[PDB]
Enzyme design. Structure first.
Site, mmCIF file in Angstrom:
data_model
loop_
_atom_site.group_PDB
_atom_site.id
_atom_site.type_symbol
_atom_site.label_atom_id
_atom_site.label_comp_id
_atom_site.label_asym_id
_atom_site.label_seq_id
_atom_site.Cartn_x
_atom_site.Cartn_y
_atom_site.Cartn_z
ATOM 1 N N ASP A 35 0.809 -1.234 -0.047
ATOM 2 C CA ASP A 35 -0.024 0.131 0.068
ATOM 3 C C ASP A 35 0.896 1.288 -0.035
ATOM 4 O O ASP A 35 1.280 1.649 0.965
ATOM 5 C CB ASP A 35 -0.813 -0.130 1.144
ATOM 6 C CG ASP A 35 -1.772 1.276 1.321
ATOM 7 O OD1 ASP A 35 -2.044 1.887 0.055
ATOM 8 O OD2 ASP A 35 -2.206 1.567 2.462
ATOM 9 N N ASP A 220 -1.570 5.631 -5.284
ATOM 10 C CA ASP A 220 -2.041 4.840 -4.147
ATOM 11 C C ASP A 220 -2.241 3.513 -4.661
ATOM 12 O O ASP A 220 -3.362 3.191 -4.940
ATOM 13 C CB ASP A 220 -3.076 5.379 -3.553
ATOM 14 C CG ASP A 220 -3.673 4.635 -2.336
ATOM 15 O OD1 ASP A 220 -3.141 3.633 -1.911
ATOM 16 O OD2 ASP A 220 -4.659 5.041 -1.686
HETATM 17 C C1 LIG Z 1 -12.563 4.298 -1.595
HETATM 18 O O1 LIG Z 1 -12.567 3.300 -2.163
HETATM 19 C C2 LIG Z 1 -11.480 2.350 -1.835
HETATM 20 C C3 LIG Z 1 -10.620 2.905 -0.749
HETATM 21 C C4 LIG Z 1 -9.534 1.922 -0.431
HETATM 22 C C5 LIG Z 1 -9.210 0.875 -0.966
HETATM 23 C C6 LIG Z 1 -10.349 0.535 -2.414
HETATM 24 N N1 LIG Z 1 -11.215 1.448 -2.516
HETATM 25 N N2 LIG Z 1 -9.863 -0.522 -2.933
HETATM 26 C C7 LIG Z 1 -8.928 -1.438 -2.732
HETATM 27 C C8 LIG Z 1 -9.329 -2.406 -1.529
HETATM 28 C C9 LIG Z 1 -8.242 -3.527 -1.188
HETATM 29 C C10 LIG Z 1 -7.686 -3.626 0.205
HETATM 30 C C11 LIG Z 1 -7.854 -2.588 1.122
HETATM 31 C C12 LIG Z 1 -8.583 -2.601 2.334
HETATM 32 C C13 LIG Z 1 -8.602 -1.478 3.393
HETATM 33 C C14 LIG Z 1 -7.679 -0.711 3.149
HETATM 34 C C15 LIG Z 1 -6.762 -0.305 2.143
HETATM 35 C C16 LIG Z 1 -6.937 -1.456 1.214
HETATM 36 C C17 LIG Z 1 -5.778 0.658 1.999
HETATM 37 C C18 LIG Z 1 -6.434 2.036 1.845
HETATM 38 C C19 LIG Z 1 -5.352 3.099 1.514
HETATM 39 O O2 LIG Z 1 -4.459 3.060 2.467
HETATM 40 C C20 LIG Z 1 -5.917 4.441 1.147
HETATM 41 N N3 LIG Z 1 -4.951 5.521 0.862
HETATM 42 C C21 LIG Z 1 -5.297 6.952 1.162
HETATM 43 C C22 LIG Z 1 -5.867 7.223 2.574
HETATM 44 C C23 LIG Z 1 -7.254 7.505 2.676
HETATM 45 C C24 LIG Z 1 -7.545 7.573 4.104
HETATM 46 C C25 LIG Z 1 -6.723 7.562 5.140
HETATM 47 C C26 LIG Z 1 -5.405 7.285 4.875
HETATM 48 C C27 LIG Z 1 -4.451 7.217 6.098
HETATM 49 C C28 LIG Z 1 -4.544 5.818 6.757
HETATM 50 C C29 LIG Z 1 -2.981 7.543 5.601
HETATM 51 C C30 LIG Z 1 -4.975 6.951 3.736
HETATM 52 N N4 LIG Z 1 -7.330 1.919 0.612
HETATM 53 C C31 LIG Z 1 -8.614 2.488 0.921
HETATM 54 O O3 LIG Z 1 -9.084 2.951 1.690
#
Ligand SMILES: COc1cc2cc(n1)NCCCCc1cccc(c1)C[C@@H]([C@H](O)CNCc1cccc(C(C)C)c1)NC2=O
Length: 377
Positions: A35, A220
């Site tokens: 990630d 990302d």
């Molecule tokens: C909206 O639709 C989304 C969102 C996300 C994943 C997906 N679809 N599909 C892929 C799913 C595959 C597996 C997965 C599950 C849970 C979390 C994540 C993967 C990582 C996260 C990333 O870390 C997000 N990065 C940016 C970010 C956003 C908010 C907070 C933070 C903090 C923690 C730094 C970071 N993915 C998602 O949340």
């Protein structure tokens, strides 16, 4: 020695890409999602209906308790757990072992996915967005400090169930063709970049370029879709709808909810436009572009029926937290996370998407004035 890391990633479409790791002594094997959109290393460490296995701290003689809690809220999912350290290795990676921070996940909500095959997450971004705060050193920072691994990694995410490569410590030249084009990392927290122009089928969206980066743009690998700010999403969907108005799609298709199907091998790819994202370059007034085919932003999904019809989901969705260049954008490109030189490189991947009359591309140089004005403040 990078050949040992080629094809070290696996995954299921829409469920992230994972690499095999070991934690503890004796080594416990776990599959870990890669990630670039976060900075915590965390593993399931208590029973869960969707976990095939989990980290057992009691069975590791090298485990050290940090006596500190932690929680991470992602866009939808979240987890909480206990901080500690332990020895970590990557079997299909560099031949090193490092002592790293590990969040032992004890409780979670909509994080693990039923049947996913991964049990943890490797946040590869910078300490600034680590929980509980930036004093918790991310895994990749520990690796670079404790070993001679150079401070960069590269990701080759391949579509169709899916595979890829995470080259830790370098660039493997057999994984791409053509030239690498680099965009600056704006700030070291997320892998933040600046988008300076957007075109669809060659037509400029003609928006204030600040709109493309409101309130940030990030790369990302942990998010499936291309996520676009409200104003940019509305303009992009309007243009994609008009280009494909030959056929009619349920409005839920455009929300990423429903799926569209066509007779096996008759998908009308030609009616869907290409998307060109122009990124800030390395020299004054210079940018480059990456071109996205509909085979990237129309994610193929399994049809729950008896039909043998190719079904897809619209892999572009609206954001309220800036642009997200997700996995569907990275697929078909070789993406170099050159932390040492604060830059991200893009080149056409060896596993690029194939259209008949069109091709994904990374092209430059372009002249773009006032690129500094495109970053949001
Ligand atoms: C909206 O639709 C989304 C969102 C996300 C994943 C997906 N679809 N599909 C892929 C799913 C595959 C597996 C997965 C599950 C849970 C979390 C994540 C993967 C990582 C996260 C990333 O870390 C997000 N990065 C940016 C970010 C956003 C908010 C907070 C933070 C903090 C923690 C730094 C970071 N993915 C998602 O949340």
């Amino acid at each position: 020695s990078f050949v040992e890391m080629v094809d070290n990633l696996r995954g299921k479409s829409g469920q992230g890409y994972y690499v095999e790791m070991t934690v503890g002594s004796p080594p416990q094997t776990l599959n870990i999602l890669v990630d670039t959109g976060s900075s915590n290393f965390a593993v399931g460490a208590a029973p869960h209906p969707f976990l095939h296995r989990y980290y057992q701290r009691q069975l590791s003689s090298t485990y050290r308790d940090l006596r500190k809690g932690v929680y991470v809220p992602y866009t939808q999912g979240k987890w909480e757990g206990e901080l500690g350290t332990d020895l970590v290795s990557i079997p299909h990676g560099p031949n090193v072992t490092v002592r790293a921070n590990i969040a032992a996940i004890t409780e979670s909500d909509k994080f693990f996915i039923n049947g996913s095959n991964w049990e943890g997450i490797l946040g590869l971004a910078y300490a600034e967005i680590a929980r509980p705060d930036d004093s918790l050193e991310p895994f990749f920072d520990s690796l670079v400090k404790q070993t001679h691994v150079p401070n960069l990694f590269s990701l080759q995410l391949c579509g169709a169930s899916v595979g890829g490569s995470m080259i830790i410590g370098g660039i493997d030249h057999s994984l791409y063709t053509g030239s690498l084009w680099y965009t600056p990392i704006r700030r070291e927290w997320y892998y933040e970049v600046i988008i300076v122009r957007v075109e669809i089928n060659g037509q400029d969206l003609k928006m204030d370029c600040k709109e493309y980066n409101y309130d940030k743009s990030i790369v990302d690998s942990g998010t499936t879709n291309l996520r676009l700010p409200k104003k940019v999403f509305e303009a992009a969907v309007k243009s994609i709808k008009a280009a494909s108005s030959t056929e009619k799609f349920p409005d839920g298709f455009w929300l990423g909810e429903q799926l569209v199907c066509w007779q096996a091998g008759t998908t009308p790819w030609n009616i869907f436009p290409v998307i060109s994202l122009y990124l800030m370059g390395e020299v004054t007034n210079q940018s480059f572009r990456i071109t996205i085919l509909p085979q990237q932003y129309l994610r193929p999904v399994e049809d729950v029926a008896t039909s043998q019809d190719d079904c897809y989901k619209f892999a572009i969705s609206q954001s309220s937290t800036g642009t997200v260049m997700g996995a569907v954008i990275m697929e078909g490109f070789y993406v170099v996370f050159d932390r040492a030189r604060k830059r991200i490189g893009f080149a056409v991947s060896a596993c690029h998407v194939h259209d008949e009359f069109r091709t994904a591309a990374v092209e430059g140089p372009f002249v773009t004035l006032d690129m500094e004005d495109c970053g949001y403040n």
